[PDB]
Amino acid sequence: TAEAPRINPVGIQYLGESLQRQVFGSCGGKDEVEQSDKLMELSKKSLKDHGLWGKKTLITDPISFPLPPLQGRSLDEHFQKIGRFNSEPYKSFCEDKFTEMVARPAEWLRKPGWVKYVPGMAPVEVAYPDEELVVFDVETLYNVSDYPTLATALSSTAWYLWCSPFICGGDDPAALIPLNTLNKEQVVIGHNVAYDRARVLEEYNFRDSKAFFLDTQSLHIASFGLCSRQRPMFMKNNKKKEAEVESEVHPEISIEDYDDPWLNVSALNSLKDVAKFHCKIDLDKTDRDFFASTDKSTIIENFQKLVNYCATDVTATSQVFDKIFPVFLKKCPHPVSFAGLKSLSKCILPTKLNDWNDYLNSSESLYQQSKVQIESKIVQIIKDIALLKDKPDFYLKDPWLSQLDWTTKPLRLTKKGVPAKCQKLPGFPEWYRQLFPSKDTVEPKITIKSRIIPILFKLSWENSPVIWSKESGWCFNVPHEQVETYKAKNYVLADSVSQEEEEIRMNNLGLQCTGVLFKVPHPNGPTFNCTNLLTKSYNHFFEKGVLKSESELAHQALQINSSGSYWMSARERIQSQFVVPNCKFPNEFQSLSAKSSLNNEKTNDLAIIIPKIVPMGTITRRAVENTWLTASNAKANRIGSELKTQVKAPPGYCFVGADVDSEELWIASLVGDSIFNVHGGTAIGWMCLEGTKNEGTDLHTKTAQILGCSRNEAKIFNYGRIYGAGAKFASQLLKRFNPSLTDEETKKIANKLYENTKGKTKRSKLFKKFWYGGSESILFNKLESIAEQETPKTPVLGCGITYSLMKKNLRANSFLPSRINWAIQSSGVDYLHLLCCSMEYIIKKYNLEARLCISIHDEIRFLVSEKDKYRAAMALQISNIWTRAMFCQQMGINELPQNCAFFSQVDIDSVIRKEVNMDCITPSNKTAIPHGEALDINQLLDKPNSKLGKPSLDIDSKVSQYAYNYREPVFEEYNKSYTPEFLKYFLAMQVQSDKRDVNRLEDEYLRECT
DNA sequence: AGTCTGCGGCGCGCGGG
């Protein structure tokens, strides 16, 4: 009949028989069972205390379908052989690189194209360099055009120079450098090589390239570290640098080297700093002004100097790479990292030109037109106050008008005659003079966020006028009789210095002071000062009666400067993007499919953008790019927020994408559950695996429904709790989420939640400090135990830590939390690398037409033709199940839950938007977009023509030749340090919920020790 | 020699991911 589900002692389902056999082979161990009775008693006690024992779980029919066979007995061997197969030729080329350098030609010849210089022979004109490894550099004349001007390259036996046709003659500046990328496999090394890659001619194809661009910066980022932390690690480097610069003489003993030894090891990212650190070479940068000139005639002179400078940069980059590369190989010895770096290096974005131009024009025009009107409105009222010096009593009476300073500056005479020099304006108000930054300026310069406009439009708080003070930004006067009442309302009293100072301004005019000032609350209640009134998060107080507007214009001035913040932030970066149309280069836009099959129909507009991505830009080996990974999603009231919508696929092609769900939380649950050897051993693991995203019963949704907030807000709350936060901080976030809640209530909720979540703490001389009585106590204790280790490594792949963060380098100013954050975030990077390697191998094996388009952290997208659309999704699911199985096998568990094995939904679309059923309507864009589709696993299986085709035997024959070496997992050497009786006693104390029991257990171990 | 009179780098608020 039908198959029977497999359930462990907790109500958790495992995979079916066929999938178990195909993935894990045959593995069964009764030794886990042998000690499991003790572990199960402790786990049972915890699950009974919190209330999770006996609760219902989701049960689903088993899934079984055939899978491609593995290439090894275990997952580690299979991934090792695949990783070596993907990266073999380039890895051979990168090693055994030349050490000695070829001398330079005495004279360089200016002629268009590629010229080869070999010592002892005449120069030769060549079409391509045609070499396995070169070092490369590009220079551009950026004020005139975006296209390159000259380039040079160094190889093992020759020197090469490329000169543009523009400088030789003519007036057409559009040209690109050819390198024969499509037909020859080669490695190109260079600092910030993403800039250089966008200039190569053969890169503008939809077909996959055969060249690997390697970046020295990312290698320096990953190994030897840098001052990434803005204040903890970077400011220190800056202060020691300015101390070295100022005082030329160096004392024998440094003043603070003992406190912070790590200071010596770290270095800055810019290539000059890397060169002077590693290779002790000084580089001058003076020539960069010559390429700012707007005349091609100046480039004709100083040609020799510019060429020699570029060659010097090439030599410096080569000698820097020679030092960096072996240490990177020593830190990260698994081939999967190298293959993943190669995969992440190459990306492409297709788009259209006229659409881009229309988008830019619309956004800019609306932004300027919105700004001008409100500025004019405010100038018009300032003019009348400017003439109101006469009849001083009128401004004297009004408190806001009284707050204005109406003094005037007298006139100067030199030799009894007026200089009329360095005089702003003669005998005009002093406040009005400040508005003008220069004499020549005719109209006052006034803008939203200026400090004076909350006076120009009168505004009140609790029907009380606002007054500015030196120590406290804004304060409203409150009568004495109600002061305790405002203390009841939790309003904070003003500082004593300001209260003493305000008496003089009150007693002047003969006015009287019958009240004390009360500070206007900043969003943060304690020790924060309010500065600006038109800022966001003041909108809730606005129109509630907490803040009163006598001027309706303020409301308009609030709507403007809130519909146009994003465009103000990003207009520069967006408008400066480099786009290349198809009409300029007709022969280069080539389809992904090998068979063209005609039907081009002379497509009017196409364009390609090459994103400039640094693959490793953080201590946690994450990638950086300034515009696209930091692009905002579409919003109804924000002008120009449809950026990612501009990417479109060419006809006959589509985008297939996926996103990982609850990644870091799942990794944390796994590393917590590793000790028990059973999935769901901890309470937080059971509260992670309780349900699925589709049914709506995930952990984040439950947190959202308990706290009454959105799912994103719950995500912020949970991640902040996990990395380490405070109850006051969490209560503050609850105050942001709902403005109608009294502070004491939020504090009470935060305290009860944290008391249930974390639990109590205990300090003992044998067992150091540990947590007990909490749901996530074991997860924490394991994290601090692994953070303290001498040589920390990533649990999955054994990647080492940077030199700067090592505890030997730091004897003061220790940074414990960064290590905890680093381990998990790095594990996420390892997940991404495994996904990319598996997808590449499957694509190459089954001859699918596919190429990676973009990968924003968890999110991954591909460009796939119409015929192969479902096959890519099938490959994605296979990649996901392999990656999850590898993660479980490394920790010591040989089983996997069924619910978390596969992606929830895989989406097929034509443009880049977050959800397929989104209209994406902005103030600039008034046209709806047709919907795509999203499929789960069953809807993927029942569709026809979604199965893989016939394989190729030669690929397996090539994979089979590589070798495999056994390695012991990282947690085993950690566990062999501790003796088993100490382990059983430590766990037995960690499960107790009362302090007296823990004391008794400690004494019982002391008696057993004898 | 005095007498003011601008001025660009540094740092903090404030938004995007």
Place this chain on the structure above:
DNA sequence: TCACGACTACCCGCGCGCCGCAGACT
């Protein structure tokens, strides 16, 4: 009685206020 001990993490760029200096007429 002191010994921790605190504390979301990883990134990007723009606008306004402040200060230690350069520069044009007595």
Place this chain on the structure above:
DNA sequence: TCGTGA
């Protein structure tokens, strides 16, 4: 870099 409890 001051603050705090068991």
